[PDB]
Amino acid sequence: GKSTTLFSRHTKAIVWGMQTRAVQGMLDFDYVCSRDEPSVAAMVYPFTGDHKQKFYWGHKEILIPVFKNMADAMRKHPEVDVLINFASLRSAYDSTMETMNYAQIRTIAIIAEGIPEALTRKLIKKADQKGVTIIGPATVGGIKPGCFKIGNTGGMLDNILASKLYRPGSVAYVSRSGGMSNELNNIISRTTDGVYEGVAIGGDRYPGSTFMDHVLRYQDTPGVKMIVVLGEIGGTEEYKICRGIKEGRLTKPIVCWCIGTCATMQASETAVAKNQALKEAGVFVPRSFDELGEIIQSVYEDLVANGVIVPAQEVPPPTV
């Protein structure tokens, strides 16, 4: 089965590809989050032979193994349950399919854009078969403050600190766009107690995991008190959210705004009709993106006033 919890303070992951700057960012993030240990246990790359790579766990220097063969990495690091796949697009499909032969991997982030849709349908099919959650393709990934950050998600430490992504808040969110997810980090940190977990499902026609997949996880995560979805013209994904609320499956406050209202350049698929349907279903929908932060704030304050959210105490972050 697909897991409800994908990441935690103890997550260890394998990164496939040659991406030193990305790994160092994750470790820097791991450090300001006051994790006990680095979140990247090893790397995989068939284009080179085994070896080690140098990174910094705070001021302390450490070594991260790089394996030529995925098996060696899996075998030597069975504590790993996540793979971040930076494979270039000629390698993304085979490598992702191979990863799924190793059952310790419960979550795969696929970074590459440009994977043919027919290939992605096959990845989805196997993933669903194995109970593996896929985030992407064509995504920067996502972020769980205090716990784990996928690759470049959240940019530089400057942004991690400004948006307080180094410690959990009560607000979870999902969107297609990695650019807008970082904006959501910002909007949410200025209007609430901060992001609990954020996922960018990517822009491909068939994403490995959908808005509803994550909304379900969030609904089932006690730490999440409040859910933000940034929806979009095209397809009928957001109706699953209407049905979910009506059938009693979804009960937490959901804020949603679907972009693409200005499609004046099927009727039920427009942002306008989806916004309206969501609003009628009980979703908190702003009158425009311009008012999204306002509605998030209003829904938050009401959760505070009635005890559902207890804003924790700010604790400055480690060295940096």
Partner 1 sequence: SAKAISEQTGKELLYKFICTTSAIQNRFKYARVTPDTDWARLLQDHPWLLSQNLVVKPDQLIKRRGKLGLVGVNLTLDGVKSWLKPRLGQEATVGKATGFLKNFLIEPFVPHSQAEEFYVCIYATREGDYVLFHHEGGVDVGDVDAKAQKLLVGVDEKLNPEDIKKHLLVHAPEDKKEILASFISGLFNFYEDLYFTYLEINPLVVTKDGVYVLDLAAKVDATADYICKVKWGDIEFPPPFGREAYPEEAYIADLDAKSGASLKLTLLNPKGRIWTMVAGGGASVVYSDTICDLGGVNELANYGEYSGAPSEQQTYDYAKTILSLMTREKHPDGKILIIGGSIANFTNVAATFKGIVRAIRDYQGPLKEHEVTIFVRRGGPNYQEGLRVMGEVGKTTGIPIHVFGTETHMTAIVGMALGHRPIP
Ligand-binding site membership of 287 (annotated): yes
**Stretch near partner 1 under the rule CB under 8 A, chosen from 46-54, 112-120, 215-223, 245-253:** 112-120
Residues near partner 1 (CB under 8 A), total: 49
Using only C-alpha atoms, the chain has a radius of gyration, in whole angstroms, of 19
Is the separation of the CB atoms in 197 and 222 below 8 Å? no
- Interatomic CA distance for residues 305 and 307, integer angstroms: 6
> What does each C-alpha distance from 102 to 46, 59, 74, 86, 110 come to in angstroms?
17, 34, 7, 18, 16
**Stretch near partner 1 under the rule CB under 8 A, chosen from 100-108, 198-206, 220-228, 277-285:** 198-206
Ligand-binding site membership of 281 (annotated): yes
What is the smallest separation between the CB atom of 296 and partner 1, expressed in angstroms? 11
Compute φ and ψ for 9, nearest 5 degrees.
-50, -20
3-state secondary structure of 12: coil
Compute φ and ψ for 65, nearest 5 degrees.
-65, 145
Binding-site string for partner 1 from residue 32 to residue 71, where x marks contact by CB under 8 A and - marks none: ----------------------------------------
236 binds partner 1 (CB under 8 A): no
Is the separation of the CB atoms in 136 and 109 below 8 Å? yes
Q: Which residues are 144's β-sheet partners?
A: 148
Which residue in 44, 140, 188, 201 binds partner 1 (CB under 8 A)?
140
**Dihedral (CA of 103, 105, 109, 110) sign:** negative
Binding-site string for partner 1 from residue 239 to residue 278, where x marks contact by CB under 8 A and - marks none: --------------------xxxx-xx-----x-------
What is the smallest separation between the CB atom of 168 and partner 1, expressed in angstroms? 20
Nearer to partner 1, 10 or 205 (CB): 205
Ligand-binding site membership of 283 (annotated): yes
Ligand-binding site membership of 68 (annotated): no
146: left (phi over 0), alpha (psi -120 to 50) or beta: left
The H or E element spanning position 282 is none
**Which residue's entry shows tokens 């948006």?**
163
What is the smallest separation between the CB atom of 292 and partner 1, expressed in angstroms? 9
The binding site for CoA consists of 278-288
Residues in touch with partner 1 (CB under 8 A): 89-90, 113-118, 121-122, 124-125, 140, 152-156, 158-159, 162, 175-180, 182-183, 185-187, 190, 203, 205-206, 230, 232, 259-262, 264-265, 271, 288-290, 293
